[PDB]
Amino acid sequence: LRRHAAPPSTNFEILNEMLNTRKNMSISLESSKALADSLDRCVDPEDPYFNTLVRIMSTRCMMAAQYFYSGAYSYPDFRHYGLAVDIYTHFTSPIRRYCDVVAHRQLAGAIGYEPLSLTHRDKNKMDMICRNINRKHRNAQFAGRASIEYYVGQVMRNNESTETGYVIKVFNNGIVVLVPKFGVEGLIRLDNLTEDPNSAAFDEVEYKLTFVPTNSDKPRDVYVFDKVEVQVRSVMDPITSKRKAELLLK
Amino acid sequence: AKDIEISASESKFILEALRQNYRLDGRSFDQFRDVEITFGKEFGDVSVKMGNTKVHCRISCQIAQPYEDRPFEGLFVISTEISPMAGSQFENGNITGEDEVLCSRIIEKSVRRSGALDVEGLCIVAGSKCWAVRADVHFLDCDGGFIDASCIAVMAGLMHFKKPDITVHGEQIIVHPVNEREPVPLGILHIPICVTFSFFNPQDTEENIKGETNSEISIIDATLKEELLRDGVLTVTLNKNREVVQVSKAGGLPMDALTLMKCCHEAYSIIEKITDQILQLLKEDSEKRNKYAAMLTSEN
Ligand SMILES: [Br-]
Ligand SMILES: [Br-]
């Protein structure tokens, strides 16, 4: 089977903190439907992409779904939060998922087509299969996302363009902006963020970072969830040899 | 002990009837008796009936501490003490007799050893507190087939039984009564079913040892009269997964290997029908208890 644990309150307390402070909103977390409804109404009229940004950000604070065998947990633990179903598994893709192969053999024995192999009726062997495909699943998505990272990083290799960015993380050492066009997150250090780093201030209560831009002299307050203009640029670090995307806001 | 006297006439008649494809109850050589399963009010209370054979099983459990060797496993025992109620042939408490120890060992190897019950799921807190499931078989009336009747009685009971729900606060065990929250069923890895074959030599020993053509007769699920006149016994246990749980032909009349294999395949068709039968009677019992629960709440 395959279950999905309900997200802890601690994961959304930080998101609701930024929402209630800046946008004056909140996510219920009372139920999956409550979480969905509150996430749905979380939309800014001046910018349609704001709702998408919150969704792609509230996805990062969800518990990882995992494969398992029905003897390892009780029935209420079979619950899949993200789908709101009492029970679930993978079956539709046996060519690209070994989990579906197991499910196929079990269904064949379920209908009486052919007796189920002993290896799929051993609680010990099933535990090894589940712990393996869980690890291979994580390694698959990470390798997949890394493949996107390299090719996109090669597109912006020798190119600079003013794209649309969104502030997702605010710190005293700088900010982190997300470019939806390339799907790449970038870090703008305080030294390259503004002039006179000793004059800049960070308010944790409001998630606001006030500073004076390098090409200006007017105190600008940069809050969170703000749509800002950002110049993209790629440079391979001479120490890590990883193609990172250096971003300069405007 | 107290013996059952069998005349030469009765011995010759029942054996000759077998030579003419006749058995007294009118069954067939490969025909298993109709198994009737009745559940009591409480969970774990099951009554199995095969013709005149009557057995009753009761599943119970209590909080106990696991063995030092197995801190993650719960306790599980099966009791099958005979009594003069099933007949004066049985001595009260005779748990060392040949047939008694065999029967006790067949059930144990079919349920306990086979791991039909998930003993790992009987653990509440590792190496401290666990459930101790007990299966008590009561032999009410004997007309043969006590092994097959017991194996069905134990399994039907275990699948029907439900233990009180438990929430754990460290080592503090909160045992919820049936009044507060509903009880929790047991974990069954597989459903073992026993089928016993009885062998008869229509000729003499010489033709069994050195005889060219085999002629030994084998019948399924013998009655008491057929059981007292057999020359060999075979108990084979299988499940719907097409696997042999255990086979026990402890001596007796030497039998052809291919014939014993035929019995195993014949038994598989029986255990399939029996297993599905048990499951259906469990569903209807669940539907009955739920329908009454709805009629009790509506009237409340
Ligand atoms: Br253990
Ligand atoms: Br009879």
From Swiss-Prot, chain A:
Query: Which species is this UniProt entry from?
Result: Saccharomyces cerevisiae (strain ATCC 204508 / S288c) (Baker's yeast)
Identify the residues that the record assigns to the S1 motif domain, covering every copy.
Answer: 153-250
Q: Tell me the superkingdom of the source.
A: Eukaryota
Its quaternary organisation is: Component of the RNA exosome complex. Specifically part of the catalytically inactive RNA exosome core complex (Exo-9) which associate with the catalytic subunits RRP6 and DIS3 in cytoplasmic- and nuclear-specific RNA exosome complex forms. Exo-9 is formed by a hexameric base ring of RNase PH domain-containing subunits and a cap ring consisting of CSL4, RRP4 and RRP40; DIS3 associates with the base ring of Exo-9. Interacts with GSP1.
Gene behind this protein:
DIS3
The misc remark on file is: Present with 606 molecules/cell in log phase SD medium. Mn(2+) doesn't support the hydrolytic activity. Activity is KCl or NaCl dependent and activity is slightly increased in the presence of reducing agents such as DTT or beta-mercaptoethanol and doesn't vary notably between pH 6.8 and 8.8.
Any idea what this protein is called? Exosome complex exonuclease DIS3
Complete-protein stretch covered: 752 to 1001 of 1001
Subcellular location per UniProt equals:
Cytoplasm; Mitochondrion; Nucleus, Nucleolus
Which lineage do the record's taxonomy fields give for this organism? Answer: Eukaryota, Fungi, Dikarya, Ascomycota, Saccharomycotina
Give the record's family classification: Belongs to the RNR ribonuclease family.
From Swiss-Prot, chain B:
Provide one Gene Ontology cellular component: nucleolus
A molecular function annotated in GO for this UniProt entry is:
mRNA 3'-UTR AU-rich region binding
Q: Which UniProt keywords apply?
A: Cytoplasm, Exosome, Nucleus, RNA-binding, rRNA processing
A Pfam family in this protein? RNase_PH_C
Listed under subunit, the entry gives: Component of the RNA exosome complex. Specifically part of the catalytically inactive RNA exosome core complex (Exo-9) which may associate with the catalytic subunits RRP6 and DIS3 in cytoplasmic- and nuclear-specific RNA exosome complex forms. Exo-9 is formed by a hexameric base ring of RNase PH domain-containing subunits and a cap ring consisting of CSL4, RRP4 and RRP40. Interacts with LRP1.
Q: What does this protein do?
A: Non-catalytic component of the RNA exosome complex which has 3'->5' exoribonuclease activity and participates in a multitude of cellular RNA processing and degradation events. In the nucleus, the RNA exosome complex is involved in proper maturation of stable RNA species such as rRNA, snRNA and snoRNA, in the elimination of RNA processing by-products and non-coding 'pervasive' transcripts, such as antisense RNA species and cryptic unstable transcripts (CUTs), and of mRNAs with processing defects, thereby limiting or excluding their export to the cytoplasm.
Q: What else is known?
A: Present with 4800 molecules/cell in log phase SD medium.
Name the protein family: Belongs to the RNase PH family.
This protein is called Exosome complex component RRP45
Q: Which organism is it from?
A: Saccharomyces cerevisiae (strain ATCC 204508 / S288c)
The root-end lineage is: Eukaryota, Fungi, Dikarya, Ascomycota, Saccharomycotina
